[PDB]
């Protein structure tokens, strides 16, 4: 066989999704044109990547790419897995490349889908707030994530979802008070400290 | 606004007809969208 060191099959397909994306007016229009293509299930992970990268060329968040992605998820469940695989793939791998102007786009992007339950709160369990397993640009991404959570839902509605989330990544309770001192310090730096009332009760008992 | 989108269609196609009136043929196949929308640096009209 002749070895394939180039991906010209992918580049032509990557061009076609980008042309679809730029030829539409509304978010429902581009959502129609992507679902018209009947993309095979192996490429539906890659199509989500093309949407997100072209959402970073915009230099500002747009509600286009949200309502584009919302009509994907409600159509068929393999789209919904494709965003759930991408959100892990973005946070665990792609944060090291992205500038801070691109992180405010993504934190507002994924914060829109999480706050309207297109992604569950359980996808936030992957994200963990330590000193070791955090990026400085990863802390920027979380900060722009929670602001879109605060702005859409409100501070009390966010409090209810984080209590039903039962996650450990943002919320250490079982011990390791250096992480509890870390997590109170990080959330108050964002501007949200009303949710940290659980940790301060846990911290002074350790003292 | 739905009515504005209709005026954008009817408006842009009148401009394309003005070129198609300039040449003596209003035919569709004679004027592929490459004619109107190619930028001026390549010889097209540069229509947006």
């Amino acid at each position: 066989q002749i070895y394939d060191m180039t991906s010209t099959n992918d580049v032509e397909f990557k061009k076609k999704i980008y042309l679809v994306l730029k030829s539409s007016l509304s978010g429902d229009e581009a959502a129609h044109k992507l679902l018209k293509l009947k993309i095979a299930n192996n490429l539906k992970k890659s199509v989500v990547d093309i949407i997100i990268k072209s959402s970073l060329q915009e230099s500002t968040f747009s509600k286009f790419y949200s309502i584009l992605s919302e009509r994907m998820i409600t159509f068929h469940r393999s789209w919904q897995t494709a965003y759930n695989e991408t959100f892990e793939q973005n946070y665990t791998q792609d944060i090291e490349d992205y500038e801070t102007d691109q992180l405010r786009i993504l934190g507002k992007f994924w914060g829109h889908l999480i706050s309207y339950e297109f992604l569950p709160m359980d996808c936030l369990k992957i994200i963990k707030l330590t000193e070791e397993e955090s990026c400085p640009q990863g802390r920027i991404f979380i900060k722009f994530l929670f602001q879109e959570l605060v702005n859409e839902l409100g501070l009390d509605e966010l409090q209810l979802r984080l209590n039903s989330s039962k996650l450990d990544g943002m919320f250490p309770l079982e011990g390791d008070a250096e992480h509890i001192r870390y997590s109170i310090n990080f959330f108050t730096a964002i501007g949200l400290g009303l949710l940290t009332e659980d940790m301060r009760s846990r911290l002074t008992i350790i003292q | 606004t739905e009515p504005l989108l209709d005026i954008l269609v009817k408006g842009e196609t009148r401009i394309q007809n003005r070129v198609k009136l300039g040449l003596n043929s209003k035919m569709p196949t004679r004027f592929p969208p490459a004619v109107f929308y190619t930028p001026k640096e390549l010889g097209g009209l540069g229509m947006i």
């Binding site: 429902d28 959502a31 129609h32 679902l35 018209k36 009509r71 409600t74 159509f75 | 009817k10 196609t13």
Partner: peptide, 27 residues
């Protein structure tokens, strides 16, 4: 079929009048 959606005619529309269902809006 023409279910109340579309144009009275494609004559003065300057379009083809081609109507396709939004695959995005289902639920």
């Amino acid at each position: 079929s023409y279910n109340g959606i579309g144009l009275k005619s494609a004559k003065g529309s300057s379009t083809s009048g081609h109507v396709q269902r939004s695959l995005a809006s289902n639920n």
